[PDB]
Design a binder for this molecule. Structure first.
Ligand SMILES: *[C@@H]1O[C@H](CO)[C@@H](O[C@@H]2O[C@H](CO)[C@@H](O[C@@H]3O[C@H](CO)[C@@H](O)[C@H](O)[C@@H]3O)[C@H](O)[C@H]2NC(C)=O)[C@H](O)[C@H]1NC(C)=O
Ligand SMILES: *[C@@H]1O[C@H](CO)[C@@H](O[C@@H]2O[C@H](CO)[C@@H](O[C@@H]3O[C@H](CO)[C@@H](O)[C@H](O)[C@@H]3O)[C@H](O)[C@H]2NC(C)=O)[C@H](O)[C@H]1NC(C)=O
Ligand SMILES: *[C@@H]1O[C@H](CO)[C@@H](O[C@@H]2O[C@H](CO)[C@@H](O[C@@H]3O[C@H](CO)[C@@H](O)[C@H](O)[C@@H]3O)[C@H](O)[C@H]2NC(C)=O)[C@H](O)[C@H]1NC(C)=O
Ligand SMILES: *[C@@H]1O[C@H](CO)[C@@H](O[C@@H]2O[C@H](CO)[C@@H](O[C@@H]3O[C@H](CO)[C@@H](O)[C@H](O)[C@@H]3O)[C@H](O)[C@H]2NC(C)=O)[C@H](O)[C@H]1NC(C)=O
Ligand SMILES: *[C@@H]1O[C@H](CO)[C@@H](O[C@@H]2O[C@H](CO)[C@@H](O)[C@H](O)[C@H]2NC(C)=O)[C@H](O)[C@H]1NC(C)=O
Ligand SMILES: *[C@@H]1O[C@H](CO)[C@@H](O[C@@H]2O[C@H](CO)[C@@H](O)[C@H](O)[C@H]2NC(C)=O)[C@H](O)[C@H]1NC(C)=O
Lengths: 59, 159, 53, 106
């Protein structure tokens, strides 16, 4: 899906509160999505193995 | 996040003013005193000349300057400390500028002091220049803080 | 906008006269960008940059 | 005064000139202080120049502070000043779209 305009994620200056919050938000998002990606890949690969073995046993 | 109070004194040319002002609320070793890292500038011979002081940055790290503005409680306090009914402080660099105006007025006494100090800060990158321009009420800095980029933090706890 | 920032093209820094009245979808700011006109600063620089973008 | 009678928001970019010394202020504006109030029916911004020396950049020790003001349709932009005004020449069409900006050397 498309995403066009977002917050800034790199900073060349020292601003404090808002910078801290933006970094926290992006980091939280990244960690949650990485967790989701690892879990989805693990689950889908387990399902692939299971379906192949099930087809062998079916035959 | 800096994680250090590394402080390096610098020698500003405060020609024409009375440095090292003190107070009876800030007691240091049974003597009237003030914040250790700031310098309270009062008049000299009933004359507060126009301060215009430059300080370059020629090292390889950012410098952090902590300074302030004194809001006295009454008008006679302003005339007593600075010999003129208003101040104006412009601290600037090539990429920044901050102008602050004192607000003479009465505040609720704290430690019997009805005046206040507003603290400001200014970061100066290498190759830049810090410029301080003032006619009074300046609580000048004494030097700079090394500002590091690290994995330090702060936490409020009674543990 | 190789030698120009979006704010410089906005105000009209003379090196940015190409960007007058131009539209876009993505503005590419270069690390070589620099201002050459009268010295200035913008309170809430990031906010104006974001809304103009 | 400048009215808005079209059907889109208008964006005004203006500024305030902080000269370096007092003789520069008297030379450019013939009075030791300015004051700029730019306002509409739903907004107001007052800015005061700060005469003082800045570190020279391109041999200029003065500065310009840039401000902006958005004016919705049917509104009116009012500019009130006694000096040090860096006036606008017109307005920017401000659209609502899917555009963005990105810093890159690619
Ligand atoms: C504006 O009004 C306020 C309050 O009405 C004034 O502040 C008050 O000033 C009085 C006397 O200057 C303070 O009382 C003193 O308390 C000390 C405490 O030990 C005592 O030693 C003195 O003998 C006297 O009783 C009072 O605390 C203070 N109140 C606050 C909240 O600070 C203020 O001075 C007025 N402004 C002007 C310009 O007159
Ligand atoms: C920023 O720092 C500069 C540098 O000192 C200050 O400029 C100086 O300001 C003083 C008082 O404002 C001027 O003194 C007066 O000058 C007039 C000139 O006609 C003279 O007739 C008076 O008797 C008095 O001496 C001084 O000339 C001036 N220097 C320059 C080079 O302009 C300025 O006041 C400071 N501003 C702030 C906001 O701190
Ligand atoms: C307050 O003090 C600052 C610095 O102490 C003053 O700024 C400095 O002014 C001098 C001369 O006006 C500048 O030097 C000049 O450099 C150019 C560069 O080519 C040269 O052509 C000139 O012959 C002269 O050497 C210096 O660059 C400048 N420093 C900064 C950081 O801007 C300022 O003028 C003082 N304010 C007042 C009101 O006097
Ligand atoms: C905002 O804009 C208004 C509109 O012009 C300004 O009001 C005008 O201000 C000038 C100078 O401040 C006044 O001129 C003086 O008026 C007095 C009145 O006694 C006269 O004796 C003087 O010789 C001089 O002519 C002018 O009258 C005044 N107009 C009105 C209708 O009040 C105002 O100054 C501007 N304020 C800002 C902050 O830009
Ligand atoms: C103001 O007080 C500071 C210290 O609080 C003085 O700093 C001393 O300066 C001299 C040279 O000027 C040095 O030899 C000392 O080592 C400094 N002492 C400290 C503790 O840093 C400063 O001299 C005082 N200035 C005036 C005008 O009284
Ligand atoms: C962007 O800026 C650079 C540097 O200001 C330009 O490179 C200059 O090109 C001119 C003529 O092409 C030369 O006279 C200069 O000597 C070059 N600069 C240097 C440092 O050598 C470049 O042409 C600019 N490009 C655009 C598109 O604005």
């Amino acid at each position: 899906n498309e995403k066009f305009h977002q917050i800034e994620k790199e900073f060349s200056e020292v601003e404090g509160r808002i910078q801290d919050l933006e970094k926290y938000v992006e980091d939280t998002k990244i960690d949650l999505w990485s967790y989701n990606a690892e879990l989805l890949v693990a689950l889908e690969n387990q399902h692939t193995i299971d379906l192949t073995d099930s087809e062998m046993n079916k035959l | 996040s800096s994680g250090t109070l590394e402080f390096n004194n610098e020698s500003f040319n405060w020609t024409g003013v009375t440095q090292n002002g003190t107070s009876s609320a800030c007691i240091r070793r049974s003597n009237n005193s003030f914040f250790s890292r700031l310098n309270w500038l009062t008049h000299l011979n009933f004359k507060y000349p126009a301060l215009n002081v430059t300080m370059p940055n020629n090292e390889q790290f950012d410098k952090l300057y902590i300074w302030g503005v004194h809001h006295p409680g009454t008008d006679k306090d302003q005339i007593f400390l600075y010999a003129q009914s208003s101040g104006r402080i412009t601290v600037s660099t090539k990429r920044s500028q901050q102008a602050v105006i004192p607000n003479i007025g009465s505040r609720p006494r704290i430690r019997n002091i009805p005046s206040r100090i507003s603290i400001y800060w200014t970061i100066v990158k290498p190759g830049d220049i810090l410029l301080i321009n003032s006619t009074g009420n300046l609580i000048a800095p004494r030097g700079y803080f090394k500002i590091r980029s690290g994995k330090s933090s702060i936490m409020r706890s009674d543990a | 906008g190789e030698n120009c920032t979006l704010i410089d093209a906005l105000l009209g820094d003379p090196q940015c006269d190409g960007f007058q009245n131009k539209k876009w979808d993505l503005f590419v700011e270069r690390s070589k960008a620099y201002s050459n006109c009268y010295p200035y600063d913008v309170p809430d620089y990031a906010s104006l940059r974001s809304l103009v973008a």
